[PDB]
Chains A and B, each alone.
Chain A
């Protein structure tokens, strides 16, 4: 890719950051839960007619490894802020992750997309209105995803790239 974009995936443990990333990179769903300490990926993709080199920085949800997360966040240009639609604390903690981004980037003006993952599950407990209101409160897009079915995966990452372009 000519244009390189540094994308950071953040959010609470277990919400599906790595499964989303692996669906983007390799079109495969991981059903195991292997907690991340640090993982980075490169993927070339055409987005809006531009050949893009995406650096995907997939971070730990476990706060024990937040020092490593912060090193990845400092290099990133845009952030996928992921919660799971069956974990209300992960949704509430989007505020924590946004505050971390503001702290590490020393800026309140950072490209961000809200992602509500695991939408294939039954008995969803974080409803669409809650999620859209939270995204609205920060002026950011909200994308529903399922890493299992691949629904929304490209839209989530491509929307973040578009947000970075807007910001540039």
Chain B
């Protein structure tokens, strides 16, 4: 329904459900923790729809509801 696709380190992938009041940190915490990933060790980017601009580095406090329908990349810092 209201989901975000997230490419993760070590060739992994997830699609996460967004609930009201979730930060990006909250929304990805379970997916990261199950995979032994600490959010403090990672950068997160919003991937764009065109190749002209730079993928947008996101703050962990970004509201997850503002990212519904997007694709993100989580990378090791």
Contact = CB atoms under 8 A, between A and B. Distances in A.
22 contacts: A22-B34, A25-B34, A25-B35, A26-B33, A26-B34, A26-B36, A28-B34, A34-B17, A36-B15, A37-B15, A38-B5, A38-B14, A39-B13, A40-B13, A40-B14, A41-B12, A41-B35, A42-B10, A42-B11, A42-B12, A42-B35, A55-B11
A100 to B, nearest CB: 20
A42 B13 CA distance: 10
Interface string A2-37: 000000000000000000001001101000001011
Interface of B is mostly: mixed
A60 B33 CA distance: 21
Nearest to B12: A40
B24 to A, nearest CB: 17
Nearest to A39: B14
Contact of B15 (A22, A25, A38, A41): A38
Interface residues of B, number: 15
Contacts, number: 32
Interface residues of A, number: 13
Interface string B19-36: 000000000001101111
B11 A40 contact: yes
Contacts of A25: 34-35
Contacts of B17: 34
Interface of A: 22, 25-26, 28, 34, 36-42, 55
Contacts of B36: 26
A41 B10 CA distance: 8
B51 to A, nearest CB: 24
Contacts of A55: 11
Contacts of B5: 38
Nearest to A38: B15
B76 to A, nearest CB: 14
B3 A41 contact: no
Contacts of B34: 22, 25-26, 28, 41
Contacts of A40: 11-14
B13 A38 contact: yes
